[PDB]
Swiss-Prot record, chain B:
One of its GO terms (molecular function) is tryptophan synthase activity. Tetramer of two alpha and two beta chains. Pathway: Amino-acid biosynthesis; L-tryptophan biosynthesis; L-tryptophan from chorismate: step 5/5. Its EC number is 4.2.1.20. This is Tryptophan synthase beta chain 1. It catalyses: (1S,2R)-1-C-(indol-3-yl)glycerol 3-phosphate + L-serine = D-glyceraldehyde 3-phosphate + L-tryptophan + H2O. Its cofactor is pyridoxal 5'-phosphate. Keywords: Amino-acid biosynthesis, Aromatic amino acid biosynthesis, Lyase, Pyridoxal phosphate, Tryptophan biosynthesis. Belongs to the TrpB family. The beta subunit is responsible for the synthesis of L-tryptophan from indole and L-serine. It comes from Pyrococcus furiosus (strain ATCC 43587 / DSM 3638 / JCM 8422 / Vc1). One of its GO terms (cellular component) is cytoplasm. Pfam families: PALP.
C-alpha cells in the first residue's frame, strides 16, 4: 500500500472490508492466464491495441532538435488512455462475480470510459455526476445514456465532483458484494494506485518495444501530462529500471505557478492525507485543501497519485508545469503541423516536449504520451480563441 | 475507365487533360515500392492500421443467428474509413509534385479528412464550402481551420454543395499543375472511382486475414453501407473472386423508398450521365436529378459509384435499403450492447446484418464494415429523441 513514505489506506472501517476483498481478488487474477487472455483479447479487438508510436517529422524539423515521437493513445477506442483501466477493472469486477459498476466524473471522460467498459462486459453502470457538471456536459451524459449507463445527478452539496465521490463511496459500502467502484486514476486508497498503474503499464510496454524496433535504442526522455498520474505511470513504469531514460511529468501550471490558480500538486503542494491516500495536495495557509484550476478538465485536481510523490522524492522522475496558454499554443501547433488534434491534457506534455526538444541533439529521442484526442475540447479552445485580440 | 457498361470520363476537354495526367501518375505510383512503403508507413503510424475485427458476442447471442464480426474503421485516425483515401491521394499528389489539395464538403467530414491528410504531408489545403453549409457546421469549419486548412466560402447561387463543386472544378482546371482535387468516394470521372476503391481495398484485405485467423474460413456474407460506395468497395473488392462469399450493400432507405425521401440509387435510380460518370442516379418524371434524403449525411447522395452498378448488374453483390428509424434503432442497440457508438451511415449496415443474422445458422459468419464512429452524429440522434 506504500510507495516509500506515500500511499496507504486512510478510510473509515466501513471501506476497509471492500478494499481488502479487492486486493485479494486482484492478487489471484493479475497473473491468472485466462484473466490476461480475456483482457488482451478485449484490448486488441475492442480497444484497437496496440496504439502506434508516431514520429512527428514536421514538428521535429520545425524545432530543429530532438526526434519527437507521439505514443498515440488518442487512437484507443473512446479517444483516451482511460479505456485501458476501464476494461481492466470491469473484467476484474466481472471475474470477481460483480454485476454492477459505479464511478464518478467531472467532465465525463471517465464516466464514458466506465459506461463503454460496462456495455462491453454486459454489466450495469451507475455514474455519479454533480448536476452542475451534468448541465455543462450534455453530450457526455447522452453518450453515457447511449452506452446503457444511468447518470445519477448529484444535487446535494456543491453539485460538483467532490459530492459525486462521497455518494459513490456511500453506494460502494452498501453494494460492494455485487458492485465494483471503478477509480479512473492512480489515486485513492490501496490497492487502486497499484491496480490502475498495472492496467496502464501496457502503454510503456508497447512504447518500449516500438522505439527499440524503430530507433534500435531506448528513448532519452519520456514526457507525459500528470493529473492524478495514470497515463504518466502507464508510460513511465516499464522504463523505471532503465536508469538513462529521463522521466518528466507535466502538471497543469494553470494561470501560472505564482497565481495560486493551477493543479501542480508535486510542484507547489504539501504532503498530507486526502481521498484516502498520503500524497502532495494543494493547501491554503491554514492547511485546508485549496481548489485547483486547469483549462484541461482532466488535469484539474488538487491532488496527485502517491507513486509520483515517491518518484519525485527519489528523483527518478522530474515534475514540471505548463500554463493554460502554453497548452493552447501546443493544441493549435500539433493540429496544423501533424494533423492530430490533441486533448488539452496531452497538449501540456506536447508543450513541454517542444521546449525540451529545442535544447537537445537531433540524434536524441523524446516519447510524448498523447493521452487523448481533443474533439471533446473544441468548445473550450474556440472560447479562448474568441477572447484573443 | 469502365466497369461493364458504367463509369467513363464524361467531362469538358478542360478537365480531360488533368484527369489524363492523374491516370499516368497513378499507373507510375500504384505499384511503386517507395509510394507503397510511405503509404503503409502513414496508415500504420499515423492512421493506426491495421484496424481490429471485433466479434460482437452479445449482439450475436441476443439475435440467436449468424456470428457478427465488426471491421472497426471507427478506430482509424479521424474516426472514419475516409482517412485511408485522404492519405492515399494526398501522398500521390505530393509525389506528383503538387503543393496544394482542394476538396468540397457540406457536412464537413471529407473537408476534415482532406485537411488532416494535407497537414500530415505539409500541403496547402483549400476546402470549397457553401456559405449555408458553413453556418450549419461551425465546429467542422473550426476543425479544418485548426488543421491549417482555408475554408473558401461559396456565396454564389444557392450557397450549397452544388456551387462549391463548380468553384472547385473551375479551380482545378486552372491549378491542376500544382493542385490535386481530392474526391472522397468512388464517384465522378475516371480515374477517381478506381483510385478511391484501391485506397480502401486495405479494409477487405485486413478483414480476410483476420477472419481466417479468428474462424479458419471466409465469411458467408459481408455487409457495408453504400453512399457513393468507397467503404463497401474497400471491404468487397478483395472477396469478389471468392464466389462463395455474398456481398450486400445497404443504401439509405430514408423515410421510405415509397415516400420519395431516400438515397437508394442502385434500387430505385435510373441510368444517366451526371458528375462525369455513367451510373444509377435518382430521377423525377422530367428525367431531372431528384433530391436525395438520409438521416445519415454520408449516405445523402442522389448518385452512386459505377462499380456498384456493375456488381448489381452481374448479380455478384445484392443491394438492399434500411430506413432512418431502423438505423437509429441499430445506433442505440450497438452502443448499449457492445459499447461502440457507430456512425449513422455504419448503423444502416448493422441494422440489415442483425436481420440477415437471424435468417442464417450459428456456424455461419457475417462481417459488417463499421465505416465510422457516431460522435459526429450525437446532435442529430438527440434531436430525433
Ligand atoms: Na494535481
Ligand atoms: Na446513393
Amino acid at each position: 500500500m506504500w510507495f516509500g513514505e506515500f500511499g496507504g489506506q486512510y478510510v473509515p472501517e466501513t471501506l476497509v472490508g471492500p478494499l481488502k476483498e479487492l486486493e485479494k481478488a486482484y492478487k489471484r487474477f493479475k497473473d491468472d492466464e485466462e484473466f490476461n487472455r480475456q483482457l488482451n483479447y478485449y484490448l486488441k479487438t475492442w480497444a484497437g491495441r496496440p496504439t502506434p508510436l508516431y514520429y512527428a517529422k514536421r514538428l521535429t524539423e520545425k524545432i530543429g532538435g530532438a526526434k519527437v515521437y507521439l505514443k498515440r493513445e488518442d487512437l484507443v477506442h473512446g479517444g483516451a488512455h482511460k479505456t485501458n483501466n476501464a476494461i481492466g477493472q470491469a473484467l476484474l469486477a466481472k471475474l470477481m462475480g460483480k454485476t454492477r459498476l459505479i464511478a464518478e466524473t467531472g467532465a465525463g471522460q471517465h464516466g464514458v470510459a466506465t459506461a463503454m467498459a460496462g456495455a462491453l462486459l454486459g454489466m450495469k453502470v451507475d455514474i455519479y455526476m454533480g448536476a452542475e457538471d451534468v448541465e455543462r456536459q450534455k453530450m457526455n451524459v447522452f453518450r453515457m445514456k447511449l452506452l446503457g449507463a444511468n447518470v445519477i445527478p448529484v444535487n446535494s452539496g456543491s453539485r460538483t465532483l467532490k459530492d459525486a465521490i462521497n455518494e459513490a463511496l456511500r453506494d460502494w459500502v452498501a453494494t460492494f458484494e455485487y458492485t465494483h467502484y471503478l477509480i479512473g486514476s492512480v489515486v485513492g486508497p490501496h490497492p487502486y494506485p497499484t491496480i490502475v498503474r498495472d492496467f496502464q503499464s501496457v502503454i510503456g510496454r508497447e512504447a518500449k518495444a516500438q522505439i527499440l524496433e524503430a530507433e534500435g535504442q531506448l528513448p532519452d526522455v519520456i514526457v507525459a501530462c500528470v493529473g492524478g498520474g495514470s497515463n504518466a505511470m502507464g508510460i513511465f513504469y516499464p522504463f523505471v529500471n532503465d536508469k538513462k531514460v529521463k522521466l518528466v511529468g507535466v502538471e497543469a501550471g494553470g494561470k501560472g505557478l505564482e497565481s495560486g490558480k493551477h493543479s501542480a500538486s508535486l510542484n507547489a503542494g504539501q504532503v498530507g492525507v486526502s481521498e484516502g491516500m498520503l500524497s502532495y495536495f494543494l493547501q491554503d495557509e491554514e492547511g485546508q485543501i485549496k481548489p485547483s484550476h486547469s483549462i484541461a478538465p482532466g488535469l484539474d485536481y488538487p491532488g496527485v497519485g502517491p507513486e509520483h510523490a515517491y518518484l519525485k522524492k527519489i528523483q527518478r522522475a522530474e515534475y514540471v508545469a505548463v500554463t493554460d496558454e502554453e497548452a493552447l499554443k501546443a493544441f493549435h501547433e500539433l493540429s496544423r503541423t501533424e494533423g492530430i488534434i490533441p486533448a488539452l491534457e496531452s497538449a501540456h506534455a506536447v508543450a513541454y516536449a517542444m521546449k525540451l526538444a529545442k535544447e537537445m541533439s537531433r540524434d536524441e529521442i523524446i516519447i510524448v504520451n498523447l493521452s487523448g484526442r481533443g474533439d471533446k475540447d473544441l468548445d473550450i479552445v474556440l472560447k479562448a480563441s474568441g477572447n484573443v485580440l
